Structure formats: structure tokens, C-alpha cells
UniProtKB/TrEMBL annotation, chains A, B:
CoA 2 binds at residues 56, 252. It comes from Streptomyces atroolivaceus. Residues 7-180 form the LnmK N-terminal domain. This is Conserved hypthetical protein. SUPFAM superfamilies: Thioesterase/thiol ester dehydrase-isomerase (SSF54637). CoA 1 binds at residues 56, 131, 252, 254. The gene is LnmK. InterPro entries: HotDog_dom_sf, LnmK-like_bifun_acyl/decarbox, LnmK_N_HDF. One of its GO terms (molecular function) is S-acyltransferase activity.
Amino acid sequence: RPEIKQAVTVRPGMCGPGSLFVGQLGDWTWETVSAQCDTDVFAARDASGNPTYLAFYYFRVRGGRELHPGSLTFGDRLTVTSGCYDQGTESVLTLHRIDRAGSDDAQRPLDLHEFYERPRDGSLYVENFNRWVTRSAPGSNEDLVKSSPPGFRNDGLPQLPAAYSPRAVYREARTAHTFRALDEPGFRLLPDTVEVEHPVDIVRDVNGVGLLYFASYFSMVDKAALALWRRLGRSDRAFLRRVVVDQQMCYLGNADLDSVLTLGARVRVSTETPGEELVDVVISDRDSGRVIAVSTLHTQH
Amino acid sequence: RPEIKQAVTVRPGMCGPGSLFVGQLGDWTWETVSAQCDTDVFAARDASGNPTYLAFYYFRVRGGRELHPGSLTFGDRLTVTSGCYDQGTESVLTLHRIDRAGSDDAQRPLDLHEFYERPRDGSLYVENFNRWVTRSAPGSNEDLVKSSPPGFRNDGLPQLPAAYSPRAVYREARTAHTFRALDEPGFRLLPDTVEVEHPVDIVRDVNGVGLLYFASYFSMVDKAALALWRRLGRSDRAFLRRVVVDQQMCYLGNADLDSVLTLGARVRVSTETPGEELVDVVISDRDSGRVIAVSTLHTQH
Ligand SMILES: [Cl-]
Ligand SMILES: [Cl-]
């Protein structure tokens, strides 16, 4: 299996202009997969005894003006509905819908059509596509290898039709370096861009197993975004006021803890709605020749 | 009421060399006080309708070689025991003991004597002393004012004897700028110190209500500590390996989101045990003339 409903009171540890909300989202994904695929995701190991991690690969957060991540304050009552979909033995799709606890029809079950074609204002839709991986060498964060812990059961799971394919979505972003095609009408590109050098921050960016922490990617993207916001003369206070109505992240790789990353950012402004923009950020590990992440944010000023 | 026992599987969102574990600790304090003092801490308001926050004031984490925060990895099974103690109507003390789920006598209730005079190796002891506050002016983070939400019930709570007084502990650290008196025998002070300028990081340091986030203070301290670790030639890899067996933080103030903070750090090395040190960090808001935090860490290299 059944979907997992929970009543959630918003805590300081899962809101604010940082990456704490996304961190909460991923911990619910690992809990939801554990419950539905008969596997202790937290302590997962492959037959050798190697630890295997249910790594974040594609991550979407979509809301809108009436509920977005920046709308959440301490003490807000929410309803969270969660469940997995079959993507075979090495990968799994986890969905989360978040509603205000009061709201009309908050009890409704997950609905792929709603998530993928008819998103409602006032609901927050989370898509986490995750893939089992292991280190290819102790202490290396490069060249992660595909895994599946023994006993991972995808068989119970509901099916996704071919139209809703996280795989397609991420393949196109890896190629284009945005999740919103550069020729969408109704946008024009500004000439101002930034390229920020970011040494891995070993106090804030690293997780419990010595990999870069998946929520830190959101922090790196917001750092590149802030830099651009600043390069084009806007205020720190207005930055804290931006409304992020949609954001997608593809995790192409991890990195070693001494790497120097590069954070590239660009923005397109709406020619219809004032103050609506698309910001694209690419995170590179120049030294290994890899793009390790791509993110697009859809914002209202 | 009764103490709150929970079985906890360690998640990526509450471990690692960052401040995520301390963030988890504070969310359990707010849940524990909510349960024992009949108050929704998350959504607390005073009679006017002003939001009132159960602010972190004094924070201790004490473990040891057999269990410290850096010992926790994904999937670890823990037992957590929590409860509040009466400190009147404007403040409350919350204790948490954390044991490995397997261990001898993990079911035992909280014991003030154990916490304050006989801490056991293999247990982690958390002390959170918190005070209700409100903003004195919309959008200001300075000059917070004492509060108590209506209906806060400290009456149920067990009593603390005069010997165990968080108040005394913090008063001495505010004066001395360490929690370990400068004349403790068995330590000598190194001449190397650092002073790091730290503009408030609006993507990573700010909480859901626009105040500096209490766990960010731990990140700022670790930044000042890393700087010192580096100034005296040690490796990033060895920094990730430090064992923090005790840490205390006093939160003297908050700061506005455009402040530039100063992070001061010093270290004393053991003359008995090799590789045991005390690192003291002071966080200043030069421009308002305030010390906003003091922290001492007891480490094994
Ligand atoms: Cl992670
Ligand atoms: Cl906080």
C-alpha cells in the first residue's frame, strides 16, 4: 504493497531557503522503498558484503504559487503520500505528494496522470528516481558501479507507462544541459552568466559514507544561482523571496572529496509573464573531464 | 509525563561530518518538549499572536571513543531516550541518551547522575537547554525578547538539583570563552590561532523563520576548526577522521542576514595523552559589538 500516508508537522530540520527540505524528501524515499521492496535500504549490502547505496539520479520538485518549498514554515500541517513504481531490479521510482492537511481531497491516492500531465496548484509533487550503486574502489567517488542488493523486490510494484519515463527526461537534460528545451517559445536568454569555482566543502557537502551528499547538489546549484542573481544586481532580500515553482536535478556523478568543482549558470527571462525565469546550472569536475550534475529551476521573481 | 523511547535507524539526513546529526537532535528536543509540556512547539505563538521560538541556548554532545557522532553510519540501529526537566516557565532542559540498539542496559531510564557525573563509554549524552524568545522588531534578528507561549506547562516535569545547572555552565563560558577552564592541568596552549571572516551564508545558514539556524553554528565552528587544522599543516583526510568526544555550544545571540561574522579559534594540546586536544571557537558580530556564540570541542586527533 500500500501507499504510505503520513501527517507531517513542518520542523526546522526540513524547511527554509537551504537544502533541508530536499534532505527530508530523500530520507522519505529511502523509508518508502524500504517498506515496499522488502529491503533495509539504510543498511543495504550486496552478496560480497559491499555496502550498496540507493543513489539519487533524477530528482524533481514541482509546486506552484499556492504551495512551493518556500511556502513551508515551522508548525505547518501537511499530508504526505508516497509510493514506489517498478523500474526493474537496479533502479526504482519514488513519488511523494504533499498537501496542506486541511485541503480538499488530500486523502486521494497517488495518480500518475496528475503527477505527469495534470499537476494541481496547491499540491507539491516529488519525483525521485534512484539507482543502486557501489564504489568501484575503496575511497574513490568516481566510476560508481551498478548494483542491486540481494532480495530487492521490485515485483510487488505498480507499473509506469512508457510515456512517463524518468529515463527519457534525464537523457535529454544530460545532452542539452537544461530540462527546458532552449527553443521553448516565450523566453529570451540574458547574456550574463557566471562560472563559480567551488572546492568541495568537507564540513557541509559530505554524507555519512564519504560521498557528496545528494542534498548538497541543491546547495551548490543555489550558490551558482545566487552568484548570477548578484552579478545582475538584485538584492539578497529578493533572493530569499524567490518562488521556485519547479526544479529538476540530474546526478550524473559523484566526486572525490578534494575536487574543485565548477558551477555554471545561465538564465532565460519570460517575454509574457514579468519576473518568471528559467535558470540552468551545470556542475563540472573539470579535472576528470565530467559533468556531474545538471539542474533547471523555474522561478517567479 | 513519561520519557520517550524510540528505535532509530540512522538516516543520511542525520549523520556525517556536517551538522545534520545536531539538526536531528534539535528536532527531537522540539518533539519531546511538545509531548511533555502540552504545547505545540512547532507552531507556538504568544497571546498577541506573535510566533515564539524555543531557541537553542546551551547545547552539549558528549560521547567517547566507543560511540561518538562520527561513529554513526547509514543503517546503524540506535535506541534514543528523551525527556524534559523543569527550568521554570521561560526555559526548559531536554536530555537525550543514545545507545546502540544491541547494547547492555539500553532500556534504562534517564539518570541525571549518569548524565552529569558518571557518563558511560558507548553512550551518547545530549543536553539541550532552550529558552522561548520572540523578535523585538519584524525582520530584526537582534535583541530577541523572552517569551513563554500561553499554556506552556512546566508543572508536570521532573526537577533538577542545584548542582546540575545549565545556567552556571553557560555563564562561565560566556565569561571565559571556553567551557574548559584555561588553567586545567595537563594541557598546553599552541601559539597558532585563526580569525576567519564569515559573511552569513544565506543559502546554507538560514532557517525557516529567517533566523540563523541553530545547527549552522556547529557548521561555523567546524569551519573555524578546519581553518586552524589547516593553518597548522594537517590533512583534510585526517580532519575527516577526528574523534569529537565532547562538544559544548553556547548561543549568546542571533544575527541579521547581512552580517559579517568573525570566527576565532584556539587549541590546547594534551601533555599526557598524545593527539587529545581542546579547541575553542568564538563567533563575533564585530559590527554590533556582540559575541554571538562560544564552543569548545574535546577531540582525539
Ligand atoms: Cl547522499
Ligand atoms: Cl533554528
